[PDB]
Design a protein around this motif. Structure first.
Motif, PDB file in Angstrom:
ATOM      1  N   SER A   6     -45.560 115.885  90.613  1.00  0.00           N
ATOM      2  CA  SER A   6     -44.646 114.755  90.249  1.00  0.00           C
ATOM      3  C   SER A   6     -45.345 113.819  89.248  1.00  0.00           C
ATOM      4  O   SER A   6     -46.468 113.412  89.466  1.00  0.00           O
ATOM      5  CB  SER A   6     -44.278 114.012  91.534  1.00  0.00           C
ATOM      6  OG  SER A   6     -43.428 112.957  91.110  1.00  0.00           O
ATOM      7  N   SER A   7     -44.644 113.511  88.184  1.00  0.00           N
ATOM      8  CA  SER A   7     -45.176 112.612  87.108  1.00  0.00           C
ATOM      9  C   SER A   7     -45.897 111.350  87.621  1.00  0.00           C
ATOM     10  O   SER A   7     -45.412 110.664  88.500  1.00  0.00           O
ATOM     11  CB  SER A   7     -43.999 112.202  86.199  1.00  0.00           C
ATOM     12  OG  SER A   7     -43.078 111.548  87.062  1.00  0.00           O
ATOM     13  N   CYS A   8     -47.043 111.107  87.037  1.00  0.00           N
ATOM     14  CA  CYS A   8     -47.894 109.927  87.392  1.00  0.00           C
ATOM     15  C   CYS A   8     -48.685 109.525  86.139  1.00  0.00           C
ATOM     16  O   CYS A   8     -49.167 110.382  85.422  1.00  0.00           O
ATOM     17  CB  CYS A   8     -48.842 110.326  88.526  1.00  0.00           C
ATOM     18  SG  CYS A   8     -49.977 111.702  88.222  1.00  0.00           S
ATOM     19  N   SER A   9     -48.796 108.240  85.915  1.00  0.00           N
ATOM     20  CA  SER A   9     -49.542 107.731  84.721  1.00  0.00           C
ATOM     21  C   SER A   9     -51.001 107.341  85.046  1.00  0.00           C
ATOM     22  O   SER A   9     -51.903 107.856  84.413  1.00  0.00           O
ATOM     23  CB  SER A   9     -48.729 106.540  84.160  1.00  0.00           C
ATOM     24  OG  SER A   9     -47.485 107.123  83.799  1.00  0.00           O
ATOM     25  N   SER A  12     -49.241 105.106  89.506  1.00  0.00           N
ATOM     26  CA  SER A  12     -47.764 104.868  89.463  1.00  0.00           C
ATOM     27  C   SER A  12     -47.153 104.839  90.873  1.00  0.00           C
ATOM     28  O   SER A  12     -45.998 104.496  91.035  1.00  0.00           O
ATOM     29  CB  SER A  12     -47.128 105.988  88.628  1.00  0.00           C
ATOM     30  OG  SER A  12     -47.758 105.864  87.362  1.00  0.00           O
ATOM     31  N   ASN A  14     -46.105 107.015  92.524  1.00  0.00           N
ATOM     32  CA  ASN A  14     -44.977 107.989  92.603  1.00  0.00           C
ATOM     33  C   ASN A  14     -45.227 108.995  93.724  1.00  0.00           C
ATOM     34  O   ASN A  14     -44.291 109.569  94.243  1.00  0.00           O
ATOM     35  CB  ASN A  14     -44.848 108.742  91.261  1.00  0.00           C
ATOM     36  CG  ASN A  14     -44.554 107.770  90.108  1.00  0.00           C
ATOM     37  OD1 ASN A  14     -44.791 108.062  88.953  1.00  0.00           O
ATOM     38  ND2 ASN A  14     -44.035 106.604  90.375  1.00  0.00           N
ATOM     39  N   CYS A  19     -53.005 111.691  91.832  1.00  0.00           N
ATOM     40  CA  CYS A  19     -52.519 112.044  90.460  1.00  0.00           C
ATOM     41  C   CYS A  19     -53.395 113.063  89.712  1.00  0.00           C
ATOM     42  O   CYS A  19     -54.479 112.756  89.252  1.00  0.00           O
ATOM     43  CB  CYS A  19     -52.418 110.740  89.650  1.00  0.00           C
ATOM     44  SG  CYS A  19     -51.794 110.861  87.955  1.00  0.00           S
ATOM     45  N   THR A  23     -52.313 117.717  84.376  1.00  0.00           N
ATOM     46  CA  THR A  23     -50.842 117.872  84.158  1.00  0.00           C
ATOM     47  C   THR A  23     -50.168 116.501  84.004  1.00  0.00           C
ATOM     48  O   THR A  23     -49.033 116.422  83.580  1.00  0.00           O
ATOM     49  CB  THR A  23     -50.232 118.616  85.366  1.00  0.00           C
ATOM     50  OG1 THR A  23     -50.550 117.812  86.497  1.00  0.00           O
ATOM     51  CG2 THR A  23     -50.942 119.957  85.630  1.00  0.00           C
ATOM     52  N   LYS A  24     -50.905 115.474  84.353  1.00  0.00           N
ATOM     53  CA  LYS A  24     -50.439 114.054  84.292  1.00  0.00           C
ATOM     54  C   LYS A  24     -49.291 113.929  85.326  1.00  0.00           C
ATOM     55  O   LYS A  24     -48.349 113.173  85.190  1.00  0.00           O
ATOM     56  CB  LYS A  24     -49.950 113.729  82.842  1.00  0.00           C
ATOM     57  CG  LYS A  24     -49.721 112.212  82.735  1.00  0.00           C
ATOM     58  CD  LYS A  24     -49.229 111.841  81.324  1.00  0.00           C
ATOM     59  CE  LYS A  24     -49.018 110.315  81.242  1.00  0.00           C
ATOM     60  NZ  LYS A  24     -48.006 109.871  82.246  1.00  0.00           N
ATOM     61  N   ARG A  25     -49.444 114.727  86.352  1.00  0.00           N
ATOM     62  CA  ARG A  25     -48.481 114.800  87.493  1.00  0.00           C
ATOM     63  C   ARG A  25     -49.343 114.741  88.755  1.00  0.00           C
ATOM     64  O   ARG A  25     -50.542 114.594  88.642  1.00  0.00           O
ATOM     65  CB  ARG A  25     -47.707 116.128  87.430  1.00  0.00           C
ATOM     66  CG  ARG A  25     -46.886 116.204  86.131  1.00  0.00           C
ATOM     67  CD  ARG A  25     -46.172 117.562  86.050  1.00  0.00           C
ATOM     68  NE  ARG A  25     -45.400 117.603  84.771  1.00  0.00           N
ATOM     69  CZ  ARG A  25     -44.694 118.653  84.431  1.00  0.00           C
ATOM     70  NH1 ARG A  25     -44.646 119.703  85.209  1.00  0.00           N
ATOM     71  NH2 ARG A  25     -44.045 118.615  83.300  1.00  0.00           N
TER      72      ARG A  25
END
Length: 27
Positions: A6-9, A12, A14, A19, A23-25
């Motif tokens: 799942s997307s994460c900066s 985040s 999320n 994180c 994959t920046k997920r």
């Protein structure tokens, strides 16, 4: 919350997991 691919900066929030920065997920 999410946990996997799942997307994460950075923190985040999320996902309750972590994180995956390649994959920046999440893991």
């Amino acid at each position: 919350c999410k946990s996997p691919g799942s997307s994460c900066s950075p923190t985040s929030y999320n996902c309750c997991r972590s994180c995956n920065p390649y994959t920046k997920r999440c893991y």
